Amino acid sequence: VRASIEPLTWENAFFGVNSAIVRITSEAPLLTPDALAPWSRVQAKIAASNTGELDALQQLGFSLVEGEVDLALPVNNVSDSGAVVAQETDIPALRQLASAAFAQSRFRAPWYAPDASGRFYAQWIENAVRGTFDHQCLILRAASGDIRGYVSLRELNATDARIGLLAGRGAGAELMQTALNWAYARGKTTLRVATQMGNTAALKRYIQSGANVESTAYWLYR
Amino acid sequence: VRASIEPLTWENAFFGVNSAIVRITSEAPLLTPDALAPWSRVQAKIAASNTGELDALQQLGFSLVEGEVDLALPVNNVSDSGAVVAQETDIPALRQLASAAFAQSRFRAPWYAPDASGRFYAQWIENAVRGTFDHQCLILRAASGDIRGYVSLRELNATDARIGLLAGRGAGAELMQTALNWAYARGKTTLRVATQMGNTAALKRYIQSGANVESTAYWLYR
Ligand SMILES: CC(=O)SCCNC(=O)CCNC(=O)[C@H](O)C(C)(C)COP(=O)(O)OP(=O)(O)OC[C@H]1O[C@@H](n2cnc3c(N)ncnc32)[C@H](O)[C@@H]1OP(=O)(O)O
C-alpha cells in the first residue's frame, strides 16, 4: 500500500491531539510502520468492498472503529413539515441535544477523550445555525415550544444537498420531509445522508423515505 | 468480559481445522487469552452497534473480517419469472458458478486455506440443489438453456423464508421475483436476505425490491 500521511489540522486544534489521515494513491510514498510511528492517532477510510486494503491496513496495525453507509434520496415536491429555521438563540438548546445524541460517533472513547464526541457535534450543530459548516439547521417544536427534532443541511453542488445531523425520537418522517423540501426549494435532485452501520433506526428511516445505498466504508484507526 | 466458546463442529470437519465461535454473554466463563489458546481459529459475530464488544474483542487480538447487513421485505404481489428447480445434473455448473461468484467471503485467505471459500460456496449451492421442498436452488435460464442466474431459498418458520445465495449479472430483478414467488407458494409473509456490507450492488437491488434493514453485524476472527 502507498499512501500520503497528512495532519488533520482542524481536528488537531479542536481535540488537542496529534492526528493524521492516510490517503491511498498510486503515486504516494510506501505506507510503512516507520512513517506511521510518531503520530498519536492515524485514520484511514476505505471502501467496505476493498478487502485488499483492509488486510493491508490491519497488517500496518490499524483497527476497525466503525462502518459507514452513505445513502441518496430522490428529491421531489414533498411539501413543508412546518419546521422553522434555527436562530442564534436556539444554539444552547441544540448544542445540548446534539452532545447527548452524538456521543457515540467515530470520535468515541477509547480513541478520543470521553467528552470529545459530544463536543464535536455540539460544535457541528452550532456551526449549522451560524451557516459556517452546514448552511442551516431546521427545527420542529412541541406544543410546549421545546425542540422535538432538528436537521442540519448544506448544498453540495448544482444537483445535491446533504444532511449533516438529524435527531428526534418519533420525528424521523417529518425531519426527512423537512430535509427533502429544503433541497427541493434549492433546485436539488438528490439528497445525501450518511449514517453509522450500527444505527439501524436511522437506516430504516432513510430507506422508508426513499433512500438507497450509494457507498459503504470502514474507518480504521492506529 | 464473559463469553462461551464452542467448537464449530461442521466447519472443523469440512475445512479440517480446530476452530471455535465466541459469544459474549453474562452467564459464561471469563473470556481470557488462556480460554482462546487451544484453537487454530476463533470467530465472533457481534452487532455493529455494540462497540463495547468490538473493543473487548480487539483487546484480545481479534480483527475485522467483514460486515453483514440483514434485510427483509414483505411478500405481497407475486408473479412467475419462469425459473425452474435445479436438478442433480445442474450441480457441476452451479458449483463452478458459486465458487467463483462468492470468492471474497469471510472464508478468504489469509484466514482460511486458499481453496476454502470456493469449496464452502460450492457445497452450499450443492446442498440447496439436493434439498427438498423446504430448501431449494432455483435457476433462471437464458434462451440458450444456459444458467442466467440462481437463487437458493430456505423456509425458516411459519412466516419467513430466507435467500441464501443469489447471483446472476443483469438478473437481480428476476431473481428477487423468483424468491418472492417461492416464499408466497409456502404461505410465507416475510422474505429475509443478508449480504456483505461491501456489496452495494446487492444492497441496491434488495432496497429497490422493497427491502429494509433489520440488523447489521461484524465478523471478527483471531
Ligand atoms: C445524519 C446523522 O446524524 S445520522 C444519525 C441519525 N441520528 C441519530 O441516530 C439520533 C438518534 N436517533 C433518532 O433521533 C431517531 O431514532 C431517528 C431520527 C434516527 C429515527 O426516528 P424515527 O424514524 O421517528 O424512529 P423512532 O425514534 O420512533 O425509533 C423507533 C424505535 O427505534 C429505536 N431506536 C431509535 N433510536 C435508537 C438508538 N440510537 N439506539 C437504539 N435504538 C433506537 C427505539 O427503541 C424505538 O422504539 P421501538 O424499537 O420500541 O419501536
Ligand SMILES: CC(=O)SCCNC(=O)CCNC(=O)[C@H](O)C(C)(C)COP(=O)(O)OP(=O)(O)OC[C@H]1O[C@@H](n2cnc3c(N)ncnc32)[C@H](O)[C@@H]1OP(=O)(O)O
Ligand atoms: C444473498 C446473497 O448472495 S447476497 C450477494 C449477492 N450476489 C452477488 O454479489 C453475486 C454477484 N452479483 C450479481 O449476481 C448481481 O450483480 C446482483 C444479484 C448482486 C445484482 O443484480 P442486478 O441488480 O441485476 O445488478 P447488475 O448485475 O446489473 O449489476 C449492476 C452493476 O453492479 C456491478 N456489480 C455486480 N455485482 C458486483 C460485485 N459482487 N462486486 C462489484 N460490483 C458488482 C456490475 O458490474 C454492474 O456494473 P455496471 O452497471 O457498471 O455494468
